[PDB]
Write a protein that binds this DNA or RNA. Sequence first.
RNA 1: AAAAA
Lengths: 155, 156
Amino acid sequence: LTRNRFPRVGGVSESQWEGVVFTVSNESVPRWVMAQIQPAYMGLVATQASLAAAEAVAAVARRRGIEVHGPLQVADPNDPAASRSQVALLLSELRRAGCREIAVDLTGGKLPMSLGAFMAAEEAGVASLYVATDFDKHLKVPDMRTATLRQISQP
Amino acid sequence: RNRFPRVGGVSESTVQWEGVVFTVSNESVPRWVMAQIQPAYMGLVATQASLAAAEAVAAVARRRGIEVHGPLQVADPNDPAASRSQVALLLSELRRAGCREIAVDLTGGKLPMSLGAFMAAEEAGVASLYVATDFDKHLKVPDMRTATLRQISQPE
RNA sequence: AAAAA
């Protein structure tokens, strides 16, 4: 059979990975993951609309001494194939730079961006992560006081 | 090592899928998908919070002659494992009930629910779909008029 | 809030 199999699904990581690749829609959630994981390497995949947010994340990362790859851009946030291709490129680029353990944080972007990132993570044998939060009812944004680093799959 | 040989594309057919399983957050998108695919069977996975919306979808479907399975429930929308288990059961239940071509619509529910549904679809060799819209910047809502059925993955 | 909004 050629059918895919997911032997380890779910769970929580509360720190390890030294590299993280993000799909990007906002800057605050990747900045939180950066503070939790303290990676030495970072990859970023964004859209035209979220490019500025991704550049804000990279600017904070560089001032902490993190090696940043990207932001790479996808032309269509609805297309899972473009996000798969760009995340797979960054995972390869991080590995060729010496990065060992890498995770893909697929929280940001539209669902096809996250699903393409997941497929690229699975094809590379790397873990996929998701930042679970409750919604801040009074500030109308994710409540990062509630943030938990959940694990989607560990190949 | 998993591999995804067929990723992306656009789907336009009222006869390709006999059944659709939804992860549920709202009733509007599943009702749109029902109209487009016109399935004979439907499965539904919900949380305690989205159970009422899933029941609204089921009620509409029953009155159109669709055989509805579920809603099954997951305790936590942030955990992929429960959604994966419940979608896997529904895919099996639909196959046992006579449904030969099933899709999983990933659009609804929290992202971990969708990711669990994707993993169950892949393990069952069934296709995953997404309802793409452009943002209706006038109403600050997804623009349902722009809705197109996207293919996420088509397992071999 | 759970269709990047």
